[PDB]
Design a protein around this ligand. Structure first.
Ligand code: HEM
Ligand SMILES: [Cu+2]
Ligand SMILES: [Cu+2]
Ligand SMILES: [Cu+2]
Ligand SMILES: [Cu+2]
Ligand SMILES: [Cu+2]
Ligand SMILES: [Cu+2]
Lengths: 334, 81, 334, 334
């Protein structure tokens, strides 16, 4: 009974990092308490000054990743400050009943609510805002993130062998639908609500204007590239709350991948490209064997390079000539 | 006679809640739901929009001027007749 | 030798219901006889009065679901009444040879044909019309449904444990390509043939005007909502003959899912969202744990809420606070 | 040590054939040497005379399939003749490091380079050109193919039983983005560089003008249809370097399918339709049981029949009435 269990409060961290956790644990079930505060804000989403009238959990796209273990209870306090214009709520795909909690978390500006649910299924699960009557707008504008429910003794391969990651990154991919005006330029809006009508027109074409990792073109590049080292095992959590994507690590692989994101199923190995269904989160493990800069991207290459769905991972370590060697560098044909 | 600016504002913003009835917003064209509002009159309705009420943010969450908001209220009332 | 096998006759029922069947059976192979009659008709596909010049098996979109067991022979009498304008046929993905039977079932208006094939592979399989040179039009106009071939021993989990359902529902998802006129309104055509040219132009854009479950926006709502009780196991069969979809049960899960639809493969568990490839049928089992009205939808939320790909399941029973509890109702921020 | 290992040279063949290989082999690991020469050229891609300013490996779309065995090393000499206009390189999804080899194989016209990498993961893997800043254009213009890395022990089913094919075919599916002029006619360009800007605009709409198997509408039909016979087992390798596809054999099945294309994972059986993620290659086995002309296609039927993503397989042999029988040929309704 949840009321009798120890309660732990967790401090969330901004994507792409994930809050410190346990993988395999000897602890039994607990109630894990989290708080998120909704923030509506205009955000610049590309290199060319284009703005989105955005909606976020905790000020970020995606919202922060919440980690518990299978059998824990998630207890979320959801705060909607009086400074916001719209009502919001939360739907956890990891939860059972009441439209994922959406029916129990309807908060107008100036209100808050607390939901508890049992995280009785292991895996990475999307959570997202779902206000009745305006669901897609809130999702596409930025209101989604991941809940990760780890098996109590950690991840396992198809034969039951233990898999352990040294670091976890969370990547939320966002299909954006920014209206253009008749002059052919992207529209900038004074308020969130004024953006709606023109945005739904674009939504109905099913053609995103931009598709971005973590809230903007190049969010996960340059100074903000992900990082790793040869020998390090990374977990790459990938959420897409609205539209399909196909993650690929250029020069790497998914060593073990749960593309449907549910840890009680055996993972697939050696993937070049995997597939995240719109409305889900999946997870991939990779152990780096080569240093260098990698691209992590949606392998519809138009979506990646033209529309924005690409990031980098900068990897330190020793080059391995057995795995790959330049035999003859580029030179004139004989 | 209605002004095109009202419908335009409605289609850009107000529609997000009033098309269906987000947070129990009276739906556009709902004849029975709108009857008591029509009876309050346009000035009272406009005052409510400007102030905000429940899940409806001040000015219906827009930066429109009072005349444009009046026109949108007028369009909404018209659809309920 | 299928000549010499006993015959049985099935009375088909309209979706979302599925005709009564055995799961596990003690019967051996039989020749199972079905009849379907083609109906071309103008259909209203939303509550606004928008029309489609539709083509159907047995008067419905999707056509009825046909259930046999692995090793049975399906014997279909296909009738194309004189009232119709177009030639039709049937291609069973569950059949082997002659383009799924299409080459052997070409029926002009006023003709019928009888096809037998061995259902030697277990799974949910699409059937659809496929008249040479006209395939996409007939399919997107409504001519598809599902053949379910159950293992003779019933459904099994990955360890070979028996899985039983209390009721089966069949959902056919249809991407529609309805032309618009200069006034921005959907076009209404006096005859099926008159709709052809304009419809082909819309199809080539690859953008559906509507995406509907069972022939209409909100088809699976109100008196035609799916129903269940807490403790009940439902099998949700989902067909998409032309385009991908990503089913999701809001507030629920796919307890056991065969997303590629083929029962000799182990199912996956605990899914939030699964994936039905265009040109296939898949199936998910779920046991209800909470009462309430669930949404069952395509989790491209634009496709669901804007274009029509969403329905309801109304579930009776007692709320479970252990699984989910509103700890604090929406109230002012302290 | 890869040096010191025996070297062998393989002569490539044009799609849809695949160069003679070994499945299960008694051979130890070797360095397998290949050469490919890049060819930029104008190609007619449909039966109306529409042209593509194309770029190819070895003069074909897709490039040839390279077969080794797990533990072999691939040593590719890539040649960019002085007759070409653009720089090129190669990214092997089968490889580990340096953006798949792209960083090590940047060749200007008049240059060549030699790359070695260890093929340490079994499966079918895309290779494609990836010049920095130019990746999507080079890929959609034709620069992709398949590397097949067979397990040393050959293909195996989920229970570890040997699977063997009699012939392999390789199909590359290409989503093309051909610009139109003010008159609504496809543009024809004097030079490759000339096509660039207009093509990028079409790409950004995410809507292909054409989707073709092996470089043109109807490439795999008529005199050029694939062939087999009843009792013969065929491997169908399907690559799509940029966009998702859903292969289906009309009147057949995927007996054993690795849709993500990685042979250390168990295959699924009895598939009606499978799914190749954009940026990947997958593989299906089928043993023919019926003679006749089959269609092999992308089962978005608009993509297949309207846009070009369809081929034929002509199959010799004896009709099997047990599997399918015309009981009553089309005849007038009484
Ligand atoms: C300028 C655009 C808008 C106009 C002209 C408008 C108009 C109106 C009017 C005339 C009323 C009746 C006043 C009353 O109930 O006494 C009303 C009520 C309401 N509106 Fe709006 N509205 C707009 C925007 C919005 C938006 C964006 C929302 C959703 C965030 C919304 C939600 C509601 C709700 C919930 C009510 C009922 C208030 C209650 O009884 O608690 N409205 N609106
Ligand atoms: Cu929200
Ligand atoms: Cu959801
Ligand atoms: Cu037909
Ligand atoms: Cu088909
Ligand atoms: Cu190139
Ligand atoms: Cu690639």
């Amino acid at each position: 009974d949840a009321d009798k269990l120890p309660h732990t409060k967790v401090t969330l961290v901004a994507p792409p990092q994930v809050h410190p956790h346990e993988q395999a644990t000897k602890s039994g079930p607990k109630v894990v308490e989290f708080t998120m505060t909704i923030e509506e804000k205009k955000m610049v989403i590309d290199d060319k000054g284009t703005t989105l009238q955005a909606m976020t959990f905790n000020g970020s796209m995606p919202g922060p990743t919440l980690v518990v273990h299978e059998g824990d209870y998630v207890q979320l306090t959801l705060v909607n400050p009086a400074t916001n214009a719209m009502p919001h709520n939360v739907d956890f795909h990891g939860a059972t009943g009441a439209l994922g909690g959406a029916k129990l978390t309807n908060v107008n500006p100036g209100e808050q609510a607390t939901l508890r649910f049992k995280a009785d299924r292991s895996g990475t699960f999307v959570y997202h805002c779902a206000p009745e009557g305006m669901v897609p707008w809130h999702v596409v504008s930025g209101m989604s993130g991941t809940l990760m429910v780890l098996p109590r003794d950690g991840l396992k391969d198809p034969q039951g062998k233990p898999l352990h990651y040294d670091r976890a990154y969370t990547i939320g991919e966002f299909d954006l639908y920014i209206p253009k005006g008749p002059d052919g330029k992207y529209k900038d809006y004074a308020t969130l609500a004024e953006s709606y009508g023109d945005t739904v027109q674009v939504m109905r074409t099913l053609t995103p204007s931009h598709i971005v990792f973590n809230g903007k073109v190049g969010a996960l590049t340059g100074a903000n590239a992900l990082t790793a080292k040869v020998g390090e095992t990374v977990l790459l959590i990938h959420s897409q709350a609205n539209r399909d994507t196909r993650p690929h690590l250029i020069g790497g692989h998914g060593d073990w991948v749960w593309e449907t994101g549910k840890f009680a199923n055996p993972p697939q190995r050696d993937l070049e490209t995997w597939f995240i269904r719109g409305g889900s989160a999946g997870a991939a493990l990779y152990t780096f064997k080569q240093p260098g800069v990698y691209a992590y991207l949606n392998h519809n290459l138009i979506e990646a390079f033209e529309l924005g769905a690409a990031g980098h991972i900068k990897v330190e370590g020793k080059w391995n000539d057995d795995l790959m060697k330049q035999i003859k560098a580029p030179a004139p044909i004989p | 006679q209605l002004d095109p600016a009202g419908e335009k504002l409605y289609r850009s913003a107000c529609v997000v809640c009033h098309a269906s009835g987000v947070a129990n917003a009276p739906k556009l064209g709902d004849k029975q739901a709108w009857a008591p509002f029509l009876a309050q009159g346009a000035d009272a309705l406009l005052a409510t929009v400007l102030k905000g009420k429940g899940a409806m943010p001040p000015r219906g969450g827009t930066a429109a001027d009072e005349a444009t908001l009046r026109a949108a209220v007028a369009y909404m009332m018209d659809a309920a007749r």
